[PDB]
Design a protein around this ligand. Structure first.
Ligand code: FES
Ligand code: FES
Ligand code: FES
Ligand code: CL
Ligand code: CL
Ligand code: CL
Ligand code: CL
Ligand code: CL
Ligand code: CL
Ligand code: CL
Ligand code: CL
Ligand code: FE2
Ligand code: FE2
Ligand code: FE2
Lengths: 367, 367, 367
């Protein structure tokens, strides 16, 4: 059954820890500003001190209140609790002072957790887990860190377990539900109702070193369905006329659960998606677009396109439906043991391979 | 105690299954239209295909999503899931196609549940349970199916266990709370504060074949109370003056839990009530009025009176208070084990007879 | 650990019963008026009958509905249920009549709980518990019942366990969070960021007879902190310029959990606080100000300044922040076993003494 081929995947209700996970976008943090996030059940407080983004547990060691209720900073590099003034050093999380009791004997005897942080491609990543952090590149799809590119994205909260997000991203026939998105005609896309594996090389598992993932060779080893038929009659057909754009030549997912749609939502872009667990029933959905650039002008041109088109016409215009689609599955999988009652079909094998690889390679399980 | 005289009634938190239950009104469904309902914990999707109302489980066999999120029909007699296009035959619930993968090998190897449906007197009834359906008439009070009558009603959701609804309907002294309803003077009713059993033939149990139920002979074996006294002083008195109408000559309840008030809310009408479980804490309250008719003209006259008077002046004007009355009992009975702590009095014996009959005859228990 | 030092305090999630607790203010009840309250998990109905405030269980013995849904009284000294008319004697809670069934055999054979009530200093106190009530003075801080004073207050609901309320009131360094309240400059207060115990006599435990409690001698055995320093630099300093008022010379808490701030929020006043449990996660916060008076004129002057100044400028302007401060602790202590994970420091010892005294002297534990 399910609990037999991918047990650790089913156990990772709260995600795979001992992996890097995005928390926010670098531009969300100005010097001295605070941003509260919840990752894999942990409340984290982010801030920028002396130009560097720091991550510390969003909970005071005294009476456990979150600093985010009223975040205070009286000296860059520290955070002070709004309740009794306990002050912590962001570099090591140690209690270095108590504003309400100078010289208190608890100073230097207490500390809270701080997390390793690395900002890459404008994204703030945080290492969650007890192990010492490994290279960030091991937890990202290949190409994400390309130096000759620029990235722009957004994040939002989705009311479903993170796994439903990943499986909604790495699903080659769910695209049927996007057939009426204004982005399809909006960007003159030749968009099929689904992709069906045409041979045994349709899916490739990368399990040699890191990163590890599953790749769907949509453009070479799949058959796209542009027509829907019911009992011998064509009841639906995609629009294939004139000059149309080709997207999604390949789609892949990589541990700890990051999607890569290449190219998408336009031939000149690549779309990455993360589904970071917030709680057992919620996740933070990140959408990041990657554009190849040759200099500052291309960067500026991309930023403008993102603001005027890509973001709202695609990240919302195309993907908004994916949000309620995920949430529509929450009860079944989250409450009714859908993991053992689902009935899959051929195209879902890529998802099965992902669950198997994830169950075998996820560095740490958080239930 | 309770768990000893009517144990199966106490166990039937989610209702008695293997019985017919109303789901909606026939006029709520036009050809191709969809109506989602939840009955005894089961989500059901109703539609009209080729003129006939069909009932199918509102949950896809693939990833369990409900079709009601975005119901699709590309061929009358089928329903297609909005997610990956799995299409089902409404007659048998079998998967007959997959819009995103024509000829997929799962076709014909999967199916979901469909329910027997029977429309009578403008009401859509659905058979819930594993057993094969028996005659509809066995689950309705006598007279409901009278051919020389026409029926009109409404349904609404109530936040209480269904048993609290049934017992609020089949309660001869709770009417005290309706004394100030504008319908009392609105329809010149001689309406008492309560009916107290006057002899041993006040209540009669019908437990021979079907339908089965309990009847209160209010007009001949009960004493109506038109005056409320306290410490020897008359503190309240009903208005008995001029030409007033007499209603509620008899009130009865029949398995699986259907009320019959004869006559009510007017001498020319009979009122039926159903309290179909939605969940363990909610039920769908149906109010159906029956009028004897001699032809099309009488039907039209009834439909007009219903729209202009009966529905809002009585079904709401009189009964609305019954809704919060039921919900006011939810915590006690639903959370504080009120079933074993309640303290009944003589008039409640008709309810005791009903719980006993239901516990012994309910065809199926759904906990 | 905590479970070993103050076990009964940790068990009293729903408060200490067999103690008097405030329910409302006397002026909230006019003759024949009703006020519903929930104390230590019990729903209570208050009313004034023949000039006297009465307290009866807000739940009918018949089908458990609360009278508060629609409180009825047809004879001063009784309460009648809105559902079937069961009527109870407020003096002994016995069923003395049934409006819907005169002479019903259940009359005199049924009864509900009534509570001892005592009004003092404009406050309605109710005795919760199974024991016979003891003197009210045993559950109040010394000075509360002073005959040459007048009291005025307000109450509100707070979303946190009651113990978090008490410990927030009896905390000498949490005042840091109040530094920016408009009441500080509003009443020209010389207000420190915290009070730190300066010697061994800083806290005194009164455990000889009743009332019992812990007293902090702030003005004589504590060191007030008017500056906040971080890594050697003054980052915050209170305003100490000329003619300012001195308050909080002493603060104390007494069983079952009543605070006394002397003087506060002004030198001419004393502030009392109660934190009566509503449920396991909620409490009713009472704030009562005491002013010494010499006659009806002083009473009038106090009532006027309470309305024009004390209430909104202090009870709200100063204390409102204490509400979310308490609630910010609810998850940690209420759901994440904060009682054993908290890490206290020297000033918290007064709270530790209070927990110990309460665990040893609370008359009754309600979990
Ligand atoms: S809870 Fe943070 S200093 Fe007290
Ligand atoms: S969930 Fe219905 S077709 Fe996939
Ligand atoms: S529930 Fe109060 S009289 Fe029936
Ligand atoms: Cl978040
Ligand atoms: Cl369509
Ligand atoms: Cl593990
Ligand atoms: Cl009245
Ligand atoms: Cl059974
Ligand atoms: Cl309250
Ligand atoms: Cl400040
Ligand atoms: Cl005890
Ligand atoms: Fe999608
Ligand atoms: Fe009623
Ligand atoms: Fe405070």
């Amino acid at each position: 059954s399910a609990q037999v081929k991918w047990p650790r995947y089913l156990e990772a209700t709260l995600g795979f820890d001992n992996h890097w996970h995005p928390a926010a976008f670098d531009h969300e943090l100005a010097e001295g500003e605070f941003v509260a996030v919840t990752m894999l059940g942990e409340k984290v407080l982010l801030t920028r001190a002396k130009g560097e983004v720091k991550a510390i547990a969003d909970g005071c060691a005294h009476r456990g209140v979150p600093f985010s209720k009223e975040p205070l900073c009286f000296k860059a590099g520290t955070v002070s609790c709004w309740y009794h003034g306990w002050t912590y050093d962001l570099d090591d999380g140690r209690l270095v002072d108590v504003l309400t009791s100078p010289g208190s004997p608890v100073i230097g005897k207490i500390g809270i957790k701080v997390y390793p942080v690395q900002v890459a491609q404008g994204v703030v990543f945080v290492f969650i887990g007890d192990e010492e952090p490994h290279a960030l590149s091991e937890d990202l799809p290949p190409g994400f860190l390309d130096e000759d590119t620029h990235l722009l994205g957004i994040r939002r909260t989705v009311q479903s377990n993170w796994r439903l997000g990943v499986e909604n991203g790495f699903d080659t026939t769910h695209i049927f539900m996007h057939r009426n998105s204004p982005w399809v005609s909006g960007n003159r896309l030749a968009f099929p109702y689904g992709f069906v594996p045409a041979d045994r090389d349709a899916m490739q598992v990368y399990d040699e070193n890191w990163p590890k993932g599953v790749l769907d060779r949509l453009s070479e080893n799949y058959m796209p369905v542009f027509e829907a038929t019911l009992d011998g009659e064509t009841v639906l057909s995609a629009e294939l006329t004139g000059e149309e754009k080709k997207v999604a030549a390949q789609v892949s997912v990589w541990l700890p659960g990051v999607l890569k749609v290449d190219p998408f939502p336009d031939p000149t872009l690549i779309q990455y998606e993360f589904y970071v667990p917030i709680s057992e029933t919620q996740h933070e959905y990140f959408q990041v677009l990657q554009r190849k650039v040759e200099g500052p002008e291309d960067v500026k041109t991309f930023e403008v396109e993102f603001e005027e088109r890509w973001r709202d016409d695609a990240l919302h215009g195309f993907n908004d439906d994916d949000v309620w689609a995920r949430e529509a599955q929450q009860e079944f999988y989250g409450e009714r043991d859908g993991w053992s009652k689902e009935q899959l079909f051929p195209p879902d094998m890529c998802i099965v391979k992902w669950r198997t690889l994830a169950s075998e390679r996820g560095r740490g399980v958080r239930a």
